Design a protein around this nucleic acid. Sequence first.
RNA 1: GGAUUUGGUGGAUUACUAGCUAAUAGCAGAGGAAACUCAAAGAGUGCUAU
Lengths: 78, 422, 383, 111, 235, 49
Amino acid sequence: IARVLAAKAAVSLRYDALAEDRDDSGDIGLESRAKVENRLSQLEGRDLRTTPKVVREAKKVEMTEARAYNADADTAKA
Amino acid sequence: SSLSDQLAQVASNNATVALDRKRRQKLHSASLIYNSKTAATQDYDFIFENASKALEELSQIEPKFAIFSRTLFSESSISLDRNVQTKEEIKDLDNAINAYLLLASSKWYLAPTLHATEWLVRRFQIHVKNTEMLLLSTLNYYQTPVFKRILSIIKLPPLFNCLSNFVRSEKPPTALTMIKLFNDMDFLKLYTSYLDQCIKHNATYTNQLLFTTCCFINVVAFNSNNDEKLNQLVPILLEISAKLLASKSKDCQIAAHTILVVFATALPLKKTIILAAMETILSNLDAKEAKHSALLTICKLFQTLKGQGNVDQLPSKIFKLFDSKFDTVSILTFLDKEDKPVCDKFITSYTRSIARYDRSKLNIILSLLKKIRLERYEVRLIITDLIYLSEILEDKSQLVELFEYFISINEDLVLKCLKSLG
Amino acid sequence: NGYLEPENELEKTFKVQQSEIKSSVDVSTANKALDLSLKEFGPYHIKYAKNGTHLLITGRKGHVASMDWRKGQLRAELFLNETCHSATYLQNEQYFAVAQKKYTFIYDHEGTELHRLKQHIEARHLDFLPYHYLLVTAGETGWLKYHDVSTGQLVSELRTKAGPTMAMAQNPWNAVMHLGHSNGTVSLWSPSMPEPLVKLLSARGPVNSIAIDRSGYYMATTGADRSMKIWDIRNFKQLHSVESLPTPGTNVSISDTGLLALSRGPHVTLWKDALKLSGDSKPCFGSMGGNPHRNTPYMSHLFAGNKVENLGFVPFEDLLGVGHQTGITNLIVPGAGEANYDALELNPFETKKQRQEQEVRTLLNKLPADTITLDPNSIGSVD
Amino acid sequence: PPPDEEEQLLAKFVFGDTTDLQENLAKFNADFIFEAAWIDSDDEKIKVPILVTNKTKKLRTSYNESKINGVHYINRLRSQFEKIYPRPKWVDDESDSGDINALTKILSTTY
Amino acid sequence: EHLCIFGDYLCASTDDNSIFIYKKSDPQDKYPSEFYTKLTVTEIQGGEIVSLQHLATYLNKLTVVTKSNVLLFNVRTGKLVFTSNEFPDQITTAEPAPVLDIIALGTVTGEVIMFNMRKGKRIRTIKIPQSRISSLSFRTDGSSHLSVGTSSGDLIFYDLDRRSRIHVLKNIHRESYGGVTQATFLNGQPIIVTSGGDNSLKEYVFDPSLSQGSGDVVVQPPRYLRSRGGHSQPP
Amino acid sequence: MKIKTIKRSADDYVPVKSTQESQMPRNLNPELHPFERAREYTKALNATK
RNA sequence: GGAUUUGGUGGAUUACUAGCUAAUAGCAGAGGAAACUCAAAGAGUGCUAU
């Protein structure tokens, strides 16, 4: 940001110093300030450390006994 | 599995058993107000005393909090331990905790919530058991000083593994990692339930929606290149918007509108989905601001359509709904403003829709055509249908005038349509 | 302590299932009902610490692990490429002995070996006398050997002269050792007497297992002859002779509350109020037309195709540890453990500092070996 | 005589009972905070014994009964089935029998 | 053509819309051998037999399913107890649901009907436009999940309680060889077996949810467990 | 049914205050305390030494 | 589109006669870095330890 800020500072200054009919508003500084803030935001956003993903392991599966209806109960004699 | 692996599972299950002094130090040391040493120095009742006052301030701000005084923040709750209860008792305890987190979601900026939640952490250990619920409430506060503390005292579930780096870290979670957690398909399913609960309960607030839509949009941008996963994002994310549109809150409706627009541009989709989309968009459209946002959206959803019927007339029921919620004078005002977005094919579908169903509205079509330059095919098709009207409908001063407008502009194409049709 | 009382006369305790018990009880005991699937080095012989805080496990193929089952921490794990048979904790959970092939070994709490007992050979059963700091061994050689851990010295060596030993159990009330023999006899032994104090014929075949209640008043024995007997050891009278066993007995255990546990393969049958002189307290399998006097099983369970290696009641706990071919499982047995423990003697919540303080004072008041007698009330008489 | 309400409140404190909280927890509802077509006659006449086969033995309401008619026999059989397969939510509470749910419907049809 | 067995009764369907009933000589015999009676369904009664199905707790009734509609026959008495209402689309697959009194019916044009037989009325309907059902199966692991197999070779899973599509498995079996000829959940497990005409049998399981709470919402996609197969054409 | 099991309140046996003395439970059932008279003699012998 | 490395699972690594069970039958060398990591100890110190 020091390098980036210095570059924009020169841009703002050369406008401030030499502009024949500069409006006392700082618009060039404001827009330059916006760019460096955008430069900072993306730069600080970067994370050198690796971010681990959720682990997805395939666990062993073994079936379990499940109680089920017997159709023999249906059949009956009158 | 090795003995340690099964043993490790036992350790997780009985994390809150409060077995010995050494474990109890860790459980009690966790805090949201005080540091570890002071936290171990405090007792339950002192914590309850502060929280009870904290709830009262919240009750003044918002009445619904007063209910929890009867069940969670009661004086007799001090003696209630979760480890001793049965499953039937636990779920009822969990459900009450679930509701409290939802209301506390919008007041995290207020100090009293942080004190009030301390009792839940200390008494019921929400941080270890209701770990997912607590985070889902506080995701949008990711940069807030409260959120980093949440990470320090808590064990991340499997789905929140992306945040493991920033636990007990000077820097807060950055903007990018929020996207990474959201890119995971399973988390969207988990959050899908969470936002679903808020919509049912009318607990949603602007910081959530705007945080959601703005995270949800970024998932599209990251995943734009690969079509197949975008296809997997359709059965889930579109379902989100339909629920948001169902919410009476205008806030949710526009939140859905931001979602629909980006999907269509990112991923072209059937006209059937688009026609269904506007119909749901229009079904619960009451607020003025949503009305402005919707009309912009509806144009965009057609802007993405690039198949036969791109400019075909809206269905009869579809046509009726649009005019009721958007008078013709409204769209004229829409067509007047100079910074209007491209809506040439939507209006073209509309002009034909008027042509088929309304005889009175023809003279507005003239004004509609003047306001917006229609592309020459859109002109050709409009010419095509109007030829049928003359043969079927009685000749009218407006009807011939609509022809005369086409006589003035691009005379040759008018003959071409006549040559092909009659 | 707990219980399993019925509302309705139809509703029977033995028909209840562990799933139903797990359903009613709270989460914590549901967690105490650990199950461990170890299919490789079985069968597994289990043993719990005196305070019930630690579990010592020994697979037949040589897998020995010591852990704090309740807190889910592994204290030691041993993978001896040898046949490991039975093991026991010494004065506390820190130090345990393993009856390996051809020798017995002492190990540290991390699992580090301390000594190999050259003198104890072919030992098949292990028991530790806490108040006397004596380790006992028995095996095929018919040699009953007592070793002092504190001094690391062999106290005494007594010749059974009855062949291999199939069962051994200590009497907590007088600390006299009971050994089963192929002639159906149960022999009582003391350090200072080169011949058994008492011999008790309790079977027509080899004595598979022997159990003694905490009070030292009753005894349960199971021979390899379709049989099980209950004895009054103080006065030496037979109380019950359960011959109706569907199968021969493998292991028996008696609880703090007095529950009688019988494992006959994967038979696991529990009886309440069976250790009483009354005839109606005689254990009976099933019921004869709902006869109230008949002592029906209190609880029963099915270990599926998994022969039970040994049974362990969890001290101060309503749980039955069961060692089997595929590993370990605790069954919820309401009203089995002692609800009110005594912390001066045994504390489940013992911290390291008062544990290590407990170590010295027990050493300071170690009872001499020769104090062992049939009657513990012998000290202090005119001679 | 029964205790007074002012006694019950105080006994709540002395003994530290928590049932009242749990009843409130059970009552906690989130929203507040925020005909047979045919008939078979053979069913009525058919009488079946229970005690012959082991599995049917469970169906007994009492030890004395041994033989039961078909109509009651089914009802125990249905109850025996429901224990085997608990009744899900979709079967009982839910039935199919501009509309805002258009998007949900179209997405279901289109894969 | 079709074979159904329940209790002591063996039911066989021939191509001529004739249903033969066999019964056991003895109650304690191991299989039925004796010929009880013959029941034939006429065209007026219904269309061609789709399958023979018997639902639980129905005291000697056979739930005969036809292309035209479903028919109920009491095998013991050999009488048509009930006739289901005519269905617009031909029925292709029938599967008894784990619930009492509902049977899942699959049509030619991607329609699954959970017809309640006791009430004799439709309860629900799932739409699969531009598809042909080949197999149905319910999950009995405690999750209200329905699998619908298609001749296209595509297996879809629905959550009945949530009325949503859990996941789709694409092209598991060749469409040229009939797609998914048969797909059945294992009784009481999260596992499903699948087969087809491509000389292949595949085996899929549903893993536990990765979310500590709301596991019903976060459903893991089914994962390939194992399979056996060979050449799809002569070597 | 009537299902009761032993129930340990962790707070009762492990106090919350790190400085507090742990509750020291006691029962006078003789069965919990074997070797009535030998222990006292050994302590007597220990005292005299 | 190409290349390098790697986690997990599946099938074999012994020749294919069904499951479950309580079964004569029932059932179905010297080192280094990281820590709200896990242990084993030593010393000192603090707090009514009455």
